[PDB]
């Protein structure tokens, strides 16, 4: 495996693909759909599949934000196996909280120049989605044989936001809705294969995650003409000014907890970082009695064997340690996986990128294998499951694909499934 | 210690508000899809008694309730869980012959007893440890460790299909798994049900199917070819039907060849046909071309759903007919892991209270769904336990002696578990 140069005929068939898969990576890539919106990709998804005929269905926890599934079915006794890209981008109509330059043009669009496609969400995620969308057409136009099924799975709230304290249901929430529900409601597999920017290098170990909402307490409140000064910092009555030294101490922390909890895995290293991305103490529209509380939010990447309680617990003795009362909560905890019998899927893999890219595949860095990616639902779920595609990775962060080398993806991906799906499970 | 003399006879002098709490729960209408004002009750009770509830939902009528009972630091926490939502709708005549008894709908004290499905399943087991949660802070007892209060929405087998999607239709996606994503995590987790007080640390995963068989050509009655075999007749419905009895064979064997025994407990998976529907009742002058039924299909833990399905392909082919078999919901089965420190804080307690070592679970009591899954699934070793027979069963009262004792052997364990080191 795989075939015999059945090969060969869809290799050729792909070549003659590379306008459609221009321009449905254009045309995807230029509807806007930050994760909360993803209904308008998700419907483009579920036409370009019903068009082509694989027989799409939504499958979501609502009817504007859903994942799209379509197949395209084997003869019969093999192994199936899932392609699965994001249809979550990242900028928001306006996310000038995070972002100081949350307004440019290669953000928000893309497009075809020289033989390049522009774009972040190109990107992330696109273009891999629209590798294999191309390389399904392809299996399926050059009438590949395959035994088993290939799965066409593209799903919504893939990116990392979640609801915390009055931001709750429809317009905050992720992961939830998306390739974990996908599969519970059907899109099952043998293998599956997480196509994201990785730049033809395969993972198969990402991270799990606990936030935690730190609220420190202080007080008590006075109005401004009232307030004893002066202060140590530690004892001041304001929690803001409590809390900028504990933020300190949490940098500290965090500067060592990625040493402490870096694991080598057969499927990558694992560098579970930490990061406050969030603090909010007050309201700014009344500002003449300081806060008795101040909270940040702090996402905390784990490594696969890493109890999210051990984490708290090392935050709370931080806290402790400076002598401060607070409140450690967590409000979202998700587990990191490393693939379990990731192995026939990861042969034909690297069988398939030898032929099409020509060299052994490169191992990834840390950080490709210490994030979230929706490897760990499919792990999760009994379905081994790696990322890769092609492209440097958005977190790098890049700006565009060359078509060339999505050209490559989309074969490497064809020859995969020809040879996985023609295994027997 | 002596905290436990204190505790046990604070909760005897507690019988009222457990009877209360139970009979003003499982009278507030809660049919899965429609568990919010049991919710509200519930956030509220928890309010009044200083457990500083949260409502953690996907949904803002249908939500989880996490409350806690903060310990002093150093232990190990403890989750007790039951779920708000009832089996029964109004509208369920659809599945039962008489859907609108007052059993399913209903709950009230009498005698010794407390009666009524959905105390059964399952606010009778959510009193008992709500009321042990509240004898724990109002005795004051000491405890290092956290005791998580997590009352969770659409624990019941619930699920979208076909046009039947999102809110309405939503059930263990939005339930005990979101909860603990969301910030109700502790070290070890109880799940309250009714197991005549007997433990299990073995749940049954499910994989269900939709299984639509093809026929036809549909031609209007006056024109309908007679007579024609079975297998080879235009009428799905027809078809279909000796579909049924060919899965009901498969159904007959799959438990057996998949019955498999666990140290938490020996799963007997089991199918059943849930639904079928092939054309519509109000245009039936043409017979329909395709026709559906549903299958619930349990797993024990070590089995892939699509083994599952390969046997189901099988049948279908070995009669000759055409079909889709497709999977629209899967779910893991777990036994739990580590699950030793909470399995020995409940025997010991169990033991002092009830007077007896534990049996083994009856096969059906860990070959079903219950919300251990999520837990273990999340790595928060849990187990099942708590008084009556099983509503599945299915029983239809608690003995409030026997709740009582429910309550203890909860108040028990955590002042145990609760207070070993993490
Ligand atoms: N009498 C009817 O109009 C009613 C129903 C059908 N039909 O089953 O398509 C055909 C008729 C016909 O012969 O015109
Ligand atoms: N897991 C359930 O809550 C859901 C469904 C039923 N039931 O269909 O009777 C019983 C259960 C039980 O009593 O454990
Ligand atoms: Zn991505
Ligand atoms: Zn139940």
């Given at each position: 495996m795989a075939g015999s140069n059945d090969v060969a005929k869809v290799m050729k068939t792909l070549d003659g693909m590379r306008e459609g898969l221009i321009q449905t990576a254009v045309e995807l890539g230029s509807i806007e759909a930050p994760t909360g919106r993803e209904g308008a990709a998700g419907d483009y998804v579920y036409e370009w599949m019903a068009r082509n005929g694989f027989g799409p269905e939504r499958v979501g926890v609502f009817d504007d934000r859903f994942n799209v599934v379509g197949r395209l079915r084997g003869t019969g006794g093999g192994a199936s196996l899932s392609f699965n890209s994001h249809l979550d981008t990242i900028m928001?109509?306006?996310?000038t909280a995070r972002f100081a330059?949350?307004?440019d043009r290669i953000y928000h669009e893309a497009w075809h120049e020289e033989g390049r496609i522009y774009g972040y969400s190109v990107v992330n995620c696109k273009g891999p989605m629209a590798c294999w969308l191309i390389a399904a057409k392809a299996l399926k136009e050059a009438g590949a044989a395959l035994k088993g099924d290939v799965v066409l799975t593209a799903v919504c709230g893939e990116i990392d936001c979640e609801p915390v304290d009055e931001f709750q249901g429809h317009d905050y929430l992720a992961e939830d809705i998306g390739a974990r529900y996908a599969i519970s409601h059907g899109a099952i597999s043998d293998y599956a294969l997480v196509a994201e920017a990785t730049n033809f290098k395969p993972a198969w170990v990402e991270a799990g995650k606990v936030f935690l909402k730190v609220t420190v307490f202080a007080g008590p409140s006075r109005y401004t003409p009232y307030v004893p000064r002066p202060v140590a910092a530690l004892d001041s009555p304001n929690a803001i000014v409590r809390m900028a030294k504990l933020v300190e101490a949490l940098e500290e922390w965090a500067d060592n907890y990625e040493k402490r909890y870096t694991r080598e895995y057969g499927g990558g290293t694992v560098v579970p970082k930490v990061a406050i991305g969030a603090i909010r103490g007050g309201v700014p529209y009344k500002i003449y009695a300081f806060p008795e509380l101040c909270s940040i939010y702090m996402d905390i990447r784990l490594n696969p064997?890493?109890?999210?309680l051990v984490v708290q617990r090392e935050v709370e003795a931080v806290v402790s340690k400076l002598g401060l009362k607070a409140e450690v909560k967590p409000f979202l905890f998700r587990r990191g996986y490393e693939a379990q019998g990731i192995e026939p899927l990861q042969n034909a893999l690297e069988v398939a990128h030898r032929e099409v890219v020509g060299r052994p595949t490169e191992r990834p860095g840390s950080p490709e294998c210490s994030m979230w990616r929706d490897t760990n639902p499919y792990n999760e779920l009994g379905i081994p499951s790696l990322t890769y595609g092609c492209g440097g990775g958005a977190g790098g962060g890049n700006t565009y694909f060359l078509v060339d080398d999505m050209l490559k993806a989309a074969k490497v991906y064809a020859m995969t499934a020809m040879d996985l799906c023609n295994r027997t499970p």
């Amino acid at each position: 495996m795989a075939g015999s140069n059945d090969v060969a005929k869809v290799m050729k068939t792909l070549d003659g693909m590379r306008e459609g898969l221009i321009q449905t990576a254009v045309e995807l890539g230029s509807i806007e759909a930050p994760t909360g919106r993803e209904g308008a990709a998700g419907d483009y998804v579920y036409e370009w599949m019903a068009r082509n005929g694989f027989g799409p269905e939504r499958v979501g926890v609502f009817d504007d934000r859903f994942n799209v599934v379509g197949r395209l079915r084997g003869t019969g006794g093999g192994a199936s196996l899932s392609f699965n890209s994001h249809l979550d981008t990242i900028m928001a109509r306006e996310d000038t909280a995070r972002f100081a330059d949350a307004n440019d043009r290669i953000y928000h669009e893309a497009w075809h120049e020289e033989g390049r496609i522009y774009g972040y969400s190109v990107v992330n995620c696109k273009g891999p989605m629209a590798c294999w969308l191309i390389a399904a057409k392809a299996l399926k136009e050059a009438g590949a044989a395959l035994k088993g099924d290939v799965v066409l799975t593209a799903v919504c709230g893939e990116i990392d936001c979640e609801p915390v304290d009055e931001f709750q249901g429809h317009d905050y929430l992720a992961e939830d809705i998306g390739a974990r529900y996908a599969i519970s409601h059907g899109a099952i597999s043998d293998y599956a294969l997480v196509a994201e920017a990785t730049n033809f290098k395969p993972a198969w170990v990402e991270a799990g995650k606990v936030f935690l909402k730190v609220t420190v307490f202080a007080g008590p409140s006075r109005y401004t003409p009232y307030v004893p000064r002066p202060v140590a910092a530690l004892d001041s009555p304001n929690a803001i000014v409590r809390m900028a030294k504990l933020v300190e101490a949490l940098e500290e922390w965090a500067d060592n907890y990625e040493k402490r909890y870096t694991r080598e895995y057969g499927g990558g290293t694992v560098v579970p970082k930490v990061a406050i991305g969030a603090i909010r103490g007050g309201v700014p529209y009344k500002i003449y009695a300081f806060p008795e509380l101040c909270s940040i939010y702090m996402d905390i990447r784990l490594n696969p064997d890493t109890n999210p309680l051990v984490v708290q617990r090392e935050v709370e003795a931080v806290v402790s340690k400076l002598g401060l009362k607070a409140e450690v909560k967590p409000f979202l905890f998700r587990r990191g996986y490393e693939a379990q019998g990731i192995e026939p899927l990861q042969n034909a893999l690297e069988v398939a990128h030898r032929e099409v890219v020509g060299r052994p595949t490169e191992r990834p860095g840390s950080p490709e294998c210490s994030m979230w990616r929706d490897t760990n639902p499919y792990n999760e779920l009994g379905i081994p499951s790696l990322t890769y595609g092609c492209g440097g990775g958005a977190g790098g962060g890049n700006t565009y694909f060359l078509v060339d080398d999505m050209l490559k993806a989309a074969k490497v991906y064809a020859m995969t499934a020809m040879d996985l799906c023609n295994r027997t499970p």
